[PDB]
Amino acid sequence: IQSLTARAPVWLAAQDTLNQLCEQSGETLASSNDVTEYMQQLLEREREATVERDEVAAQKRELEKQIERLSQPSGAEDSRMIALAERFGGVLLSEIYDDITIDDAPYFSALYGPARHGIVVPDLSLVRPHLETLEDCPEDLYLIEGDPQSFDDSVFNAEEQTNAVLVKSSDRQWRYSRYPELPLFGRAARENRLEALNLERDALAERYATLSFDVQKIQRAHQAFSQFVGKHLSVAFDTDPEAEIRE
Amino acid sequence: ITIDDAPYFSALYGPARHGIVVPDLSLVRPHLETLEDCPEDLYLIEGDPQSFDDSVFNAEEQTNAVLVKSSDRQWRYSRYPELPLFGRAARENRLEALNLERDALAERYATLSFDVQKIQRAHQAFSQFVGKHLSVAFDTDPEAEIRE
Amino acid sequence: LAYMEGGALRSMSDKALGALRLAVADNEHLRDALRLSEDPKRPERKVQFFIAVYQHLRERIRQDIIRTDDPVDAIEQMEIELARLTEELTAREQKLAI
Numbered sequence: 001i002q003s004l005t006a007r008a009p010v011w012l013a014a015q016d017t018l019n020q021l022c023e024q025s026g027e028t029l030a031s032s033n034d035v036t037e038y039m040q041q042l043l044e045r046e047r048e049a050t051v052e053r054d055e056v057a058a059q060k061r062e063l064e065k066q067i068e069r070l071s072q073p074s075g076a077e078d079s080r081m082i083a084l085a086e087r088f089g090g091v092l093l094s095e096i097y098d099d100i101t102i103d104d105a106p107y108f109s110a111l112y113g114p115a116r117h118g119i120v121v122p123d124l125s126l127v128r129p130h131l132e133t134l135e136d137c138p139e140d141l142y143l144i145e146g147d148p149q150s151f152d153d154s155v156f157n158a159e160e161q162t163n164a165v166l167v168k169s170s171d172r173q174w175r176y177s178r179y180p181e182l183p184l185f186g187r188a189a190r191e192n193r194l195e196a197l198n199l200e201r202d203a204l205a206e207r208y209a210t211l212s213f214d215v216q217k218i219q220r221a222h223q224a225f226s227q228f229v230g231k232h233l234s235v236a237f238d239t240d241p242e243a244e245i246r247e
Numbered sequence: 248i249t250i251d252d253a254p255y256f257s258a259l260y261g262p263a264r265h266g267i268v269v270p271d272l273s274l275v276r277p278h279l280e281t282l283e284d285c286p287e288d289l290y291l292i293e294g295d296p297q298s299f300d301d302s303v304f305n306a307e308e309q310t311n312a313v314l315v316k317s318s319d320r321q322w323r324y325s326r327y328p329e330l331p332l333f334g335r336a337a338r339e340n341r342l343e344a345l346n347l348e349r350d351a352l353a354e355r356y357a358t359l360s361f362d363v364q365k366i367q368r369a370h371q372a373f374s375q376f377v378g379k380h381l382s383v384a385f386d387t388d389p390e391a392e393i394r395e
Numbered sequence: 396l397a398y399m400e401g402g403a404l405r406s407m408s409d410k411a412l413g414a415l416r417l418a419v420a421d422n423e424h425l426r427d428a429l430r431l432s433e434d435p436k437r438p439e440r441k442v443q444f445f446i447a448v449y450q451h452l453r454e455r456i457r458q459d460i461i462r463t464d465d466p467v468d469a470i471e472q473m474e475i476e477l478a479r480l481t482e483e484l485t486a487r488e489q490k491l492a493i
Binding site for chain 2: 032033036110113114115118124131132134135137139140141142143144145146154155156161162163164166169170171172173174175176177178180233234
């Protein structure tokens with residue numbers, strides 16, 4: 001009796017603690033092994049949660065980068081392309097049609113093709129002296145001739161098609177440009193596009209926050225269990241002494 | 248196409264790097280108006296795929312770059328890109344570098360999984376001991392008591 | 396607690412009540428419950444006080460942030476919040492630096 005009495009407090013505290021720690025889980029533990037298996041389950045759940053969170057983070061990173069790509073000042077960015085506006089009088093084509101109607105914007109985009117982001121420069125023989133400077137430039141850079149203030153439509157072999165266009169670019173060379181949705185051009189609904197991207201990013205961030213919360217929950221649970229074994233394992237699952245004492 | 252001028256041809260062709268030697272435009276007009284799944288700015292070329300003559304470019308070769316009069320009032324500049332879509336070879340060196348890195352990763356992953364298993368084995372050893380012996384563990388040698 | 400003598404229990408109760416007196420200066424209700432329960436022969440009084448205290452805490456949970464009415468439960472989510480918020484702060488810091 002005296003031995004069991006001395007033993008009791010440890011065992012009862014150990015119970016109380018395990019009871020709490022376990023009801024915290026959706027399970028009833030019964031064995032040291034049982035605990036180890038629960039550890040394995042926790043580790044799997046963790047290595048999942050981390051993967052999902054990282055995936056969402058990658059998605060958010062892409063979204064933010066693209067929102068930037070749509071951000072300023074007109075067109076995609078202020079870079080070499082906007083730089084040519086002062087390297088020469090190279091006004092940006094997309095800016096030159098900043099207020100394009102959303103309905104013509106797809107046609108405008110399809111017609112202008114990759115030159116969509118091209119730059120209007122009344123003289124391109126004049127860009128020649130500086131051309132050798134452009135190593136830090138988009139690998140492949142458009143330049144156009146005409147009065148940017150009242151630029152006459154770039155003469156093209158344009159054949160308008162249902163939701164598309166066909167253009168003879170060079171001899172034996174044809175580009176077919178389908179109409180794009182929510183075009184890139186200008187400030188007509190491009191701010192709107194990036195606003196939709198921002199709204200999507202908001203849900204992405206919400207999901208990421210939830211995933212991080214879950215990951216930390218799992219971290220805390222494992223840490224609790226680890227403490228609970230460093231302490232307390234000696235006595236775990238040992239019999240109740242109280243019943244024997246009363247007997 | 249030659250590994251060395253492949254960047255040159257790539258800078259030359261730009262988006263025209265992709266695209267197809269269609270036998271005829273007369274196929275294009277009655278065919279491509281139908282498609283919607285085709286790449287948005289599909290690039291088309293007319294002539295003989297079996298031996299296609301040098302495509303028509305007003306190409307001047309700037310240092311590591313090219314300028315081509317794409318069309319009237321339309322000049323396009325381009326720089327020499329590595330990893331060209333032309334001159335793909337077998338894509339061998341790319342895959343091989345990826346192989347070196349990934350295989351180093353895989354062997355390291357094997358080492359770490361093995362170490363996980365080893366630590367696990369030690370863990371089961373301890374769990375077995377405690378489940379079996381720890382209650383008995385420590386405490387005296389009873390031989391002296393028995394003799395007494 | 397059956398394995399400790401009454402003196403230890405009394406000491407622990409009084410030691411708790413001291414800090415309770417220091418803390419309760421905030422709320423009149425808990426203070427009143429305390430000022431009634433501190434006498435020995437009214438254990439039920441203390442219980443009501445405890446009850447009130449417990450219920451009082453449940454006022455502040457902000458279910459939206461932690462979605463059950465149990466404070467002791469709430470502690471876990473508060474700690475998880477702390478951890479994740481430290482993570483997010485590190486993220487903000489890196490972003491600000493760049």
